[PDB]
Amino acid sequence: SLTNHTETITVEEGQTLTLKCVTSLRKNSSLQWLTPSGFTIFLNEYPVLKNSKYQLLHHSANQLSITVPNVTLQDEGVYKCLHYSDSVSTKEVKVIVLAT
Amino acid sequence: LTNHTETITVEEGQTLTLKCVTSLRKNSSLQWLTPSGFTIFLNEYPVLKNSKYQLLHHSANQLSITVPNVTLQDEGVYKCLHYSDSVSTKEVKVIVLAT
Numbered sequence A: 001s002l003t004n005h006t007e008t009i010t011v012e013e014g015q016t017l018t019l020k021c022v023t024s025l026r027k028n029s030s031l032q033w034l035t036p037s038g039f040t041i042f043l044n045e046y047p048v049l050k051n052s053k054y055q056l057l058h059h060s061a062n063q064l065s066i067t068v069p070n071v072t073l074q075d076e077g078v079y080k081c082l083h084y085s086d087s088v089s090t091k092e093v094k095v096i097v098l099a100t
Numbered sequence B: 001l002t003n004h005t006e007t008i009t010v011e012e013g014q015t016l017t018l019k020c021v022t023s024l025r026k027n028s029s030l031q032w033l034t035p036s037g038f039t040i041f042l043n044e045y046p047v048l049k050n051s052k053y054q055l056l057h058h059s060a061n062q063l064s065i066t067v068p069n070v071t072l073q074d075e076g077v078y079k080c081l082h083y084s085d086s087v088s089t090k091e092v093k094v095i096v097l098a099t
Helices: none
Strands: A006-012 A017-022 A030-034 A040-043 A055-060 A063-068 A077-084 A088-098 B005-011 B016-021 B029-033 B039-042 B054-059 B062-067 B076-083 B087-097
Touching: A017 A030, A017 A077, A017 A088, A030 A063, A040 A063, A040 B039, B016 B029, B016 B054, B016 B076, B016 B087, B029 B062, B039 B062
Parallel strands: A006 A088, B005 B087
Antiparallel strands: A017 A063, A030 A040, A030 A077, A055 A063, A077 A088, B016 B062, B029 B039, B029 B076, B054 B062, B076 B087
């Protein structure tokens, strides 16, 4: 179901992090994931950031899901999903990486 | 060639041009962002819908765009990103002049 305007999620270091953006259904739209640092990871199904560990999981009109395997403490922070239709809506996901 | 920080001005009501020029890198990407952080173009393709930004030029080492009929809402720091092995950033601060 829907991703809210803000969320906090956790992940054990060393495991795989799944960032899942699900939105309303809208014609001719775009979905986009940003790193906390502000770099585009995927625009729709198309990778932008060049030599990184991020991998597409799923893309369709109302969903852009990606993975970060072997999550490290440096993978922590607020990721943004942007949804571009007539206007732009934003969902911020705060990631907390858990030790051990 | 665009430095890491730039300040440029433009008269209200005129056309503002944002040119990002970088080194030539193979299989690289260029991107303009609004001060609010929305993508305007990624390479030659618009992303932000419903607005007055227009493409002027795209090639491997240049991404240039326009905002005609500029207004004071159009001021702020725009960001051009250059995605190669590494990501480099140019922030361009636009100041809009009244008269």
